[PDB]
Amino acid sequence: SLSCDASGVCDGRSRSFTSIPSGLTAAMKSLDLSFNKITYIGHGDLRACANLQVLILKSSRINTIEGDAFYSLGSLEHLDLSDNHLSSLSSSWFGPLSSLKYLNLMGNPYQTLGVTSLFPNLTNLQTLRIGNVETFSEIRRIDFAGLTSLNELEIKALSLRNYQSQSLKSIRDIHHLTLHLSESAFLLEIFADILSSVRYLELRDTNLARFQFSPLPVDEVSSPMKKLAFRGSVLTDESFNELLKLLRYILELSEVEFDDCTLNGLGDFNPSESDVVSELGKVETVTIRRLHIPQFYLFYDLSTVYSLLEKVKRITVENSKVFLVPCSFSQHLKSLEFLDLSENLMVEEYLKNSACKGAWPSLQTLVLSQNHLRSMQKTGEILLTLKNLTSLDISRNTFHPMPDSCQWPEKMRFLNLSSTGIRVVKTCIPQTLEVLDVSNNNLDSFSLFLPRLQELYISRNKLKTLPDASLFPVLLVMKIASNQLKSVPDGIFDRLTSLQKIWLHTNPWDCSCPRIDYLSRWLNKNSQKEQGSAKCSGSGKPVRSIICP
Ligand SMILES: *[C@@H]1O[C@H](CO)[C@@H](O[C@@H]2O[C@H](CO)[C@@H](O[C@H]3O[C@H](CO)[C@@H](O)[C@H](O)[C@@H]3O)[C@H](O)[C@H]2NC(C)=O)[C@H](O)[C@H]1NC(C)=O
Ligand SMILES: *[C@@H]1O[C@H](CO)[C@@H](O[C@@H]2O[C@H](CO)[C@@H](O)[C@H](O)[C@H]2NC(C)=O)[C@H](O)[C@H]1NC(C)=O
Ligand SMILES: [Lu+3]
């Protein structure tokens, strides 16, 4: 039932094949036989595909593949056998695939990679994925013998029972390593074998409650690891302190991420010499999202965090119930340039403490995108302490109507007031602004003169009339999609003399011929500026299609 195209891209995906389709050719460059029922693959099912570059056999129900089944596929660069029923992996399968770049074997019920090295002859491999949720249980020294460089290696071993020493050490260059571990029993050991190879390490679903640090036998303590990421992990204050002791080896680590993690406040370490601040070495960026902190008893030290974040330049802590960032804590974040506190519980009174006198000196960008702020004037007043602030985002906050006069930090040139519920716009908004976003609100008109405005986002409001062009002399980008606009005054866009991009879609354009003449001609003379397609209200055809006598 195949359906191929001019360039050899054939599609047999999700048919109902019970065996590879008969009579394939050497013209096919890609064959997608996913979601089928190919239970067995024999000696002569892919013989005639000498030019095949892509073979996708994901989620079929393959449980048997003859040893020389891929023998004549020397031009194969992408092989995906994921989510099948392969209980065993044969080394003869990969013998004739020296040109293979991507190999996905994950999702198969095998217990190990076998007794024979499967990839020694895959000189050009770049991406390898192996493992599964409950069967894969052993990793051996012969498993990756031969591989020297890999862009991406993913190992799913949530049921791991044993890891041999140095199994990972033979590989010298791994740009991205993703390990799915359920327990930490072998983590320490695995670290010993990846510290001189892994650039980006990613741990998934790991319970690190009982993780303990212990000296490692590095060769020169020069780890090329730049990004460390924990996702869906469980930690304790005790095991957390053990984890940061590992930083002493990754002298170059610049980004640490914690996604959907849990921090059980139990244990509560006390040993002094077993704290090791080390100023988190060279951590430049810290990102925390959806951190769940069960039973946050009373007051913790917090001082065992000041000296730790002294050199961090970017911090993000979103959707983690943050309601207060103590002043003395902010005063120690001397290098913080970017702070993102989106989706938390901040309110004026506590922001006032978080943004005290010497708080976040040198902070350039602040994001308070979805908290419990109620007053624009009060917020602006509180942020006057941040002398270096140039970008402020306070979108998705329910504000009371803004006054006519406000005080904002001196260098503020970016202000995001999106999804803020405002119905009017007033001079509280400073003339210094370059970028302003008041999209997704309840505006009926815009009359603010912003001489330096370069970008206006006013999409998703109720403007019936377009803003006067003289209001933005050097405007580069204007977004005014989804806005009840029916027409524009003749010649208005030629007056936006520096305009580069404009969004006009989703507006009930009155395509009556006399009236729509200007708008139509301008769009035909400026298609490179329009993003999306302004359509006629009623019919639905593109406004640029109209041609009036
Ligand atoms: C002003 O603030 C706006 C609202 O906070 C912001 O819009 C939001 O932009 C983010 C990132 O571009 C979007 O992210 C979400 O959606 C993407 C795509 O589905 C997901 O991959 C993300 O995980 C996340 O869920 C928001 O959807 C978007 N909200 C909307 C629709 O307004 C503006 O970009 C800000 N304006 C400026 C000038 O920066
Ligand atoms: C962040 O803003 C502060 C403003 O206070 C800058 O630090 C001040 O710099 C002036 C130089 O004009 C000194 O006279 C002050 O003594 C400094 N304030 C103090 C006491 O810290 C700071 O340079 C800005 N950060 C950067 C590097 O952009
Ligand atoms: Lu509260």
UniProtKB/Swiss-Prot annotation:
Disulphide bond pairs: 4-10, 327-356, 406-428
Organism: Mus musculus (Mouse)
Gene Ontology process terms (BP): cell surface pattern recognition receptor signaling pathway; cellular response to bacterial lipopeptide; cellular response to diacyl bacterial lipopeptide; cellular response to lipoteichoic acid; cellular response to peptidoglycan; cellular response to triacyl bacterial lipopeptide; defense response; defense response to Gram-positive bacterium
Gene: Tlr2
Compartment annotation: Cell membrane; Cytoplasmic vesicle, Phagosome membrane; Membrane raft
Glycan attachment positions: 121, 388, 416
Cited function: Cooperates with LY96 to mediate the innate immune response to bacterial lipoproteins and other microbial cell wall components. Cooperates with TLR1 or TLR6 to mediate the innate immune response to bacterial lipoproteins or lipopeptides. Acts via MYD88 and TRAF6, leading to NF-kappa-B activation, cytokine secretion and the inflammatory response. May also promote apoptosis in response to lipoproteins.
Extracellular side: 1-480
Assembly and interaction partners: Interacts with LY96, TLR1 and TLR6 (via extracellular domain). TLR2 seems to exist in heterodimers with either TLR1 or TLR6 before stimulation by the ligand. The heterodimers form bigger oligomers in response to their corresponding ligands as well as further heterotypic associations with other receptors such as CD14 and/or CD36. Binds MYD88 (via TIR domain). Interacts with TICAM1. Interacts with CNPY3. Interacts with ATG16L1. Interacts with non-modified M.tuberculosis protein MPT83. Interacts with PPP1R11. Interacts with TIRAP. (Microbial infection) Interacts with Staphylococcus aureus protein SSL3; this interaction inhibits TLR2-mediated cytokine production.
Tissue: Detected in a macrophage cell line, smooth muscle, lung, spleen, thymus, brain and adipose tissue. Cell surface expression detected in lung alveolar macrophages, dendritic macrophages and at lower levels in lung macrophages (at protein level).
Post-translational modification: Deubiquitinated by USP2.
Family recorded in the similarity comment: Belongs to the Toll-like receptor family.
Residues represented out of the complete protein: 27 to 506 of 784
Keyword entries, A-Z: Cell membrane, Cytoplasmic vesicle, Disulfide bond, Glycoprotein, Immunity, Inflammatory response, Innate immunity, Isopeptide bond, Leucine-rich repeat, Membrane, NAD, Receptor, Repeat, Signal, Transmembrane, Transmembrane helix, Ubl conjugation
LRR repeats: 28-51, 52-75, 76-99, 100-124, 125-149, 150-173, 174-197, 198-224, 225-252, 253-282, 283-311, 312-335, 336-362, 363-388, 389-411, 412-431, 432-452, 453-474
Protein name: Toll-like receptor 2
Residues carrying the site annotation Interaction with bacterial lipopeptide: 323
Outcome of gene disruption: Mutants succumb to Staphylococcus aureus infection within 5 days.
